[PDB]
Amino acid sequence: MQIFVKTLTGKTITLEVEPSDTIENVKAKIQDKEGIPPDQQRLIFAGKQLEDGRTLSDYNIQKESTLHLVLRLRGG
Amino acid sequence: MQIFVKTLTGKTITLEVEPSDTIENVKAKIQDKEGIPPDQQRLIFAGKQLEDGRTLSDYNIQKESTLHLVLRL
């Protein structure tokens, strides 16, 4: 399924993912596209921050859902 | 230096480490105490998951810091 990620500049990228993918997996995908290591990423959906160990489906993230990427400020 | 690890039960153990130890090395030490292979561990410090690749020092982990062990599901 396709989901969208709003990047640090407001631009939106498209990713192919699976409902069973973990948030950690998604962060790796974002690293590949954006060059931000997972430990520096905060991912936000529906106004809340997602935790690593959950699956996308655990958060009810569906086709064409949008996540927001935020850079951690206090380091890794 | 001594750090602490909260284990899957909530019980806290001590590990002997050095600031230059990598997270992968730390997972190895935890495997020796807890019997959970490194590729099934998630380690959390200060509310965030630590990456293989980095040293304890890279995360400003110090003496008496507490790491949290979580089982990958």
Word description of this protein:
The structure is a homodimer. With 76 residues, chain A is of the alpha+beta class. The first copy, chain A, has one domain (1-76): Phosphatidylinositol 3-kinase Catalytic Subunit, Chain A, domain 1 (Ubiquitin-like (UB roll), Roll), CATH 3.10.20. Chain A is built from 1 helix and 5 strands. Chain A has one helix spanning 23-34, and strands at residues 2-6, 12-16, 41-45, 48-49, 66-71. In chain A, strands 2-1-5-3-4 form a 5-stranded mixed β-sheet, covered by helices on one side. In chain A, strand 3 and strand 4 (48-49) form a beta hairpin. The radius of gyration of chain A is 11 Å and the shape is globular. The interface between A and B is small, with 9 and 12 residues. The PDB classes it as signaling protein. The entry lists the keywords Diubiquitin, isopeptide bond, signaling protein. The assembly is dimeric.
CATH topology of chain A: Ubiquitin-like (UB roll)
> Helix-strand pattern of chain A, N to C?
EEHEEE
By DSSP (H or I, 4+ residues per run), the number of helices of chain A equals: 1
What is the strand tally of chain A?
A: 5
Oligomer description: homodimer
Proportion of helical residues of chain A: 10-25%
The proportion of residues in beta strands of chain A is 25-35%
Protein name (chain B): Ubiquitin
Cross-link (Glycyl lysine isopeptide (Lys-Gly) (interchain with G-Cter in ubiquitin)) (chain B): 6, 11, 27, 29, 33, 48, 63
Subcellular location (chain B): Cytoplasm; Nucleus
Site (Interacts with activating enzyme) (chain B): 54, 72
